[PDB]
Amino acid sequence: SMSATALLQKAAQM
Amino acid sequence: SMSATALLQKAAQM
Amino acid sequence: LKPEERGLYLIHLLLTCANHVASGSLQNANAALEQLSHLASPDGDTMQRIAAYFTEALANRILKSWPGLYKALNATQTRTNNVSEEIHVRRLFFEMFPILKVSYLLTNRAILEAMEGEKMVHVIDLDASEPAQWLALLQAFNSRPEGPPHLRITGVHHQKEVLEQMAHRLIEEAEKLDIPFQFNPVVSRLDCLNVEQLRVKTGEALAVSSVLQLHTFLASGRTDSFLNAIWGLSPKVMVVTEQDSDHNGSTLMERLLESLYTYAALFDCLETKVPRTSQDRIKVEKMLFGEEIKNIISCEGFERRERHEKLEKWSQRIDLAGFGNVPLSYYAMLQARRLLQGCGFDGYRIKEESGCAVICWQDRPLYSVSAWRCRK
Amino acid sequence: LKPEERGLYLIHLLLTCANHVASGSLQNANAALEQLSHLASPDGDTMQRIAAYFTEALANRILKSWPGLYKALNATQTRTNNVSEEIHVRRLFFEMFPILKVSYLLTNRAILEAMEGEKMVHVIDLDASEPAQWLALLQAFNSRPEGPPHLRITGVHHQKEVLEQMAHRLIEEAEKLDIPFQFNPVVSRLDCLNVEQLRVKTGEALAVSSVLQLHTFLASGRTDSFLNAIWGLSPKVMVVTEQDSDHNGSTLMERLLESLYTYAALFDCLETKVPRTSQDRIKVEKMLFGEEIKNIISCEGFERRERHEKLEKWSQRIDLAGFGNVPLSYYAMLQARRLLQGCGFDGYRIKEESGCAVICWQDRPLYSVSAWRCRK
Secondary structure: OOOHHHHHHHHHHO | OOOHHHHHHHHHHO | OOHHHHHHHHHHHHHHHHHHHHOOOOHHHHHHHHHHHOOOOOOOOHHHHHHHHHHHHHHHHHHOOOHHHHHHHOOOOOOOOOOHHHHHHHHHHHHHOOHHHHHHHHHHHHHHHHOOOOOEEEEEEEOOOOOHHHHHHHHHHHHOOOOOOEEEEEEEEOOHHHHHHHHHHHHHHHHHHOOOEEEEEEEOOOOOOOOOOOOOOOOOOEEEEEEOOOHHHOOOOHHHHHHHHHHOOOOOEEEEEEEOOOOOOOOHHHHHHHHHHHHHHHHHHHHHHOOOOOHHHHHHHHHHHHHHHHHHHOOOHHHOOOOOOOHHHHHHHHHHOOEEEEOOOHHHHHHHHHHOOOOOOOOEEEEEOOOOEEEEEOOEEEEEEEEEEEOO | OOHHHHHHHHHHHHHHHHHHHHOOOOHHHHHHHHHHHOOOOOOOOHHHHHHHHHHHHHHHHHHOOOHHHHHHHOOOOOOOOOOHHHHHHHHHHHHHOOHHHHHHHHHHHHHHHHOOOOOEEEEEEEOOOOOHHHHHHHHHHHHOOOOOOEEEEEEEEOOHHHHHHHHHHHHHHHHHHOOOEEEEEEEOOOOOOOOOOOOOOOOOOEEEEEEOOOHHHOOOOHHHHHHHHHHOOOOOEEEEEEEOOOOOOOOHHHHHHHHHHHHHHHHHHHHHHOOOOOHHHHHHHHHHHHHHHHHHHOOOHHHOOOOOOOHHHHHHHHHHOOEEEEOOOHHHHHHHHHHOOOOOOOOEEEEEOOOOEEEEEOOEEEEEEEEEEEOO
């Protein structure tokens, strides 16, 4: 799926 | 028993 | 740490704690609450148990000062689909207390009286959760010399599982007694029930029974609208079993003091005759009595539904809706006194307030049953 | 209210909320907490679920600022005697996740290797709660060409009911396999267990197995005392299954960020393959994963026992106690990769860190199994 693991990935870059 | 109902009775008089 | 002096002390702690919540900040409220928590156990003395559930009751009220914490704490409880324990507590109260055994005998004795010579009978049960009340009816109907009448029952509850459970036990008993019998289950909460919409087959005789289910209308004229709707069906009898204690004060203090007076009496019954370690005792206090206390104290407004009031205020309110009192019979009241003689039940006594029955424990009134005829 | 943007937003809310608790008053903490509670559900999105359990986790931490409210709220919970649900969650994790199926296969494959040619075998199981790990052993022992050896197992758990349950299933299987077998149940928590006191019949071969039970000693040199006590028994092998994530930071922030990274991966497995409405999914998250999170965040000091650490720090610590590494075999690791191919389990992969097995989910390491030989 559109990973919840990926959700933190993009937010940690910010 | 020594009534718990009686416990409030004596404390309400105080 | 010595015992019986802690009994008085705990009481003073609940009042002192309640005054700080009602007026002012929790800094002084936290003081007594920590002071209370070391001294109150769910498994100890009667007053130890009482303060165990009132202490948590006031804490919840304090939490509602910060909706953030309260909502956040209650954030993982949604998948709750457990009625099997809910019926377990209703059966325990039924067995461990004579409140319902006396009420059921009284209403059925009152219902039988108004239904003499009636070939068709319609009974409406608000919060129809316990089948044993009607199990006694089918027996007694067959017992009368004339013979059983055709019988319809309307069951009201918010859970289809309970109504499916009641029908099954009810229909099976009826067929074995050779009684024409029909169960009509309606699934709805009591706020949203429309009484007039209910099916009435003409030529019937109607009876309405409300076991501890009238006082929930004082939360949301929500009451007087409802009683007149019952009046609109022209019931032969309406029997109201209701709690007999002033737990609907305007202020927290007036509501608290009288509240623990009543629940202290209920907890006495449990200590007098039940082992302290029994789970059954713990399951009724925490899950039934303790839930009530939380609603009386922690909740306010429409979400507070206990709102119990004394028999007098119910008599006037019912009278205002054009309802006539039916004095309960001398021999139905003898039997209730006979129930309370046996099966343990030592210390319970019943009195009569003006043709209505009052059940009390060591001269503290707890529950009231009254029979009402439809005026005009 | 639109979805995927709420995913990022929730994350920022947990960090912003955590910083206020760690440094300063809750007035700003309550702001994000109310903000969080409207946006987090236990039954919704993966990140919706994640924030459902971390939000309640931080609230508990805030409550401990006032021991009065916290203790008062937790005042009616004492009569808790429910292990039947506790075993239910252990069985779910076993079935819904391959964490234990891979570990069990790996340790038994490692134990079989050190016990070649041994007529007597002694296995010690710390937190022996699941019998299926040894059910595989008895099978495999009978499977080897030489024949079954005499087998003793010591079971360690804090509940006699589970040990009575394990013995029964274990002894029955042994007699049907014609294996000489003996179960020795010891009933004690892990802090209070004395390893040296344990009965050792000479001529035996000892094996020790620790499934997710070593990191509880980092709460209370509590660890190094314990490992040397195991060293004092001269075990042929000690196999340690342990979690592989840095959840033991000194500060709340360092502990929080890395914590949700790991649990986000675990919750992904559940959404990928389990319906969102299933109670089984909800029962593992809230009762197993969600309990862990509460300990990592709300608790501190000796009462915080999760304390998971990466494989490297465990390797050094075990090495310091005079333990030699035993590289896991190439063909035991092939089978674990074979378990993870079938029975759903899509996306799981296992790697090798220096002769130890690391189980990961989409390149996020979760659990580590390592085999250790007793040096000198």
